[PDB]
């Protein structure tokens, strides 16, 4: 973040979509929730129909409990790419945010079967399985999540 402040010109910083993604993810990692949202909104303003990684935005926006923004983003993302696992994981995050979670589990496993090498979908599955008051399924899903990404 200090390198952004010092070594990155402002005009490049506030216009580069990839830099916006990186700064939002970074401020998530420092658990700076307010900071990341107002730049992810700028990202969506620059282009709404981009998937890349909305997994971070879905994780943030579940915490912020903004149902309408999640609905709009899920609609757009799936209407653009139906086969991208990120759209399905965002949809499942929305569903878990609502209330029901078994269909969220089904959506997550479907997202994984789109791409078996998407670790974050697995770990989101595992974290959700804690909300089911079930551990064995959660434990197996956590192990299978860590298998895909060694450093998670």
């Amino acid at each position: 973040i200090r390198l952004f402040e010092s070594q990155i010109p402002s005009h490049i910083k506030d216009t580069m979509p990839w830099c916006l993604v990186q700064l939002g993810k970074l401020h998530f990692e420092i658990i700076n929730y307010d900071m990341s949202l107002k730049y992810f909104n700028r990202l969506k303003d620059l282009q709404p129909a981009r998937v890349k990684d909305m997994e971070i935005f879905s994780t943030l926006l579940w915490h912020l409990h903004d149902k309408v923004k999640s609905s709009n983003l899920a609609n757009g993302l799936m209407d653009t790419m139906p086969n991208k696992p990120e759209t399905w994981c965002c949809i499942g995050n929305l569903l878990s945010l609502q209330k029901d979670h078994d269909a969220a589990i089904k959506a997550f496993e479907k997202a994984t079967q789109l791409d078996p090498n998407f670790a974050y979908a697995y770990t989101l599955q595992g974290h959700e399985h804690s909300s089911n008051d079930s551990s064995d399924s959660a434990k197996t899903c956590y192990r299978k999540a860590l298998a895909c990404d060694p450093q998670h």
Binding site: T59, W62, H63, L124
Partner: peptide, 27 residues
């Protein structure tokens, strides 16, 4: 056991049943 119902009923429902025993976060 449910041997008889009200007003000389025949069958019986069961709306709810539960069993009780004794003994901030990140996504």
């Amino acid at each position: 056991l449910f041997p008889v119902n009200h007003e000389n009923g025949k069958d019986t429902h069961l709306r709810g049943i539960r069993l009780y025993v004794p003994s901030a976060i990140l996504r």
